Fold this sequence. Notes:
Elements: H1 13-16, H2 19-22, E1 32-33, E2 38-46, E3 50-57, E4 63-69, H3 74-89, H4 101-104, H5 110-113, E5 134-139, E6 146-151, H6 158-161, H7 167-186, E7 189-190, E8 199-202, E9 207-210, E10 217-218, H8 237-240, H9 249-264, H10 275-286, H11 288-297, H12 326-329, H13 332-341, H14 352-356, H15 362-365
Amino acid sequence: CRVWSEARVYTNINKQRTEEYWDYENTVIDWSTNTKDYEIENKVGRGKYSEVFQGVKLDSKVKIVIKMLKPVKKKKIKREIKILTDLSNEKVPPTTLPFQKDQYYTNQKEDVLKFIRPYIFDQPHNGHANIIHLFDIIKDPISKTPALVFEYVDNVDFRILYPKLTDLEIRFYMFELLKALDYCHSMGIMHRDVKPHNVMIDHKNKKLRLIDWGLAEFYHVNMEYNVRVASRFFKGPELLVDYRMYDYSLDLWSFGTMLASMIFKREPFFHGTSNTDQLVKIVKVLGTSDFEKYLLKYEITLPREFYDMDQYIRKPWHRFINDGNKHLSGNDEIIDLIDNLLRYDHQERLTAKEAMGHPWFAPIREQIE
């Protein structure tokens, strides 16, 4: 990195907290052997490094899921566990406390204070309740294969559920996902793989849970992260141009792409044929002028794989409106919200609390108290 960057908000969480909280390397995992605790039933999904099953906790009869880990990635398993336990064991979640603006906008560069929006959801909330809960850490008593035990959510695949959802229900659920992001960011953690497949929704209960903490990482000031994270269609510009000094705002780009998909009924929204073409697809919408301005702000030189970039005039968002999606896309508020999330420059993006204060969410906010 030539030009250094820090998170706009929650910048120093992992200075405030110590190695006991964020040092996952120097943990020892107490795997409990499952001789009589959980009964494995039928498969409910597959992961990149796991096979996931529904089952039952034998002593209470509670329905759970068991994520059986395929053999390896030991250090990254320890990271997933530390993050999950950090998120569930916090006695007093920061996002339940009264808001303190000076402890929230913690990056005090003049250039960054310009991105503070005139609106913000500044109330306590329960976003902590929207992170999937880890209940146990086990090994198969025969195989010795390790597994994670979680809360079960009665999910409908997004490709089936989302086309059913009304404008108001989309607003409701996306607000819930923002609460979850605000909380995890307040705890100094970036999810780094936000996408519909990682958001469990039990519609009849209005219940949303953010799952798949396998790529999550602790935010450390000026740390250079691996950019081979997220999933292609949801990777932000920082990932694609190899700007390693990124932060929680990556999750807001992903949230924006998810939002844009839902509202415009175009899934995925940015459909690149390869990693390299994913960037081209973004630039073909956001335009080359602002792309070049971004590279220059950070003195980014593009990875070896890239050539042009060619000249594309920005495609305005209104261009994506059609008869099929106009009931979700035909108001000025959603356009503005999307435009404020999908920005090249990660510092420019809405934070979760900013986004939650946006006018598009007014009908959800009016129903809270």
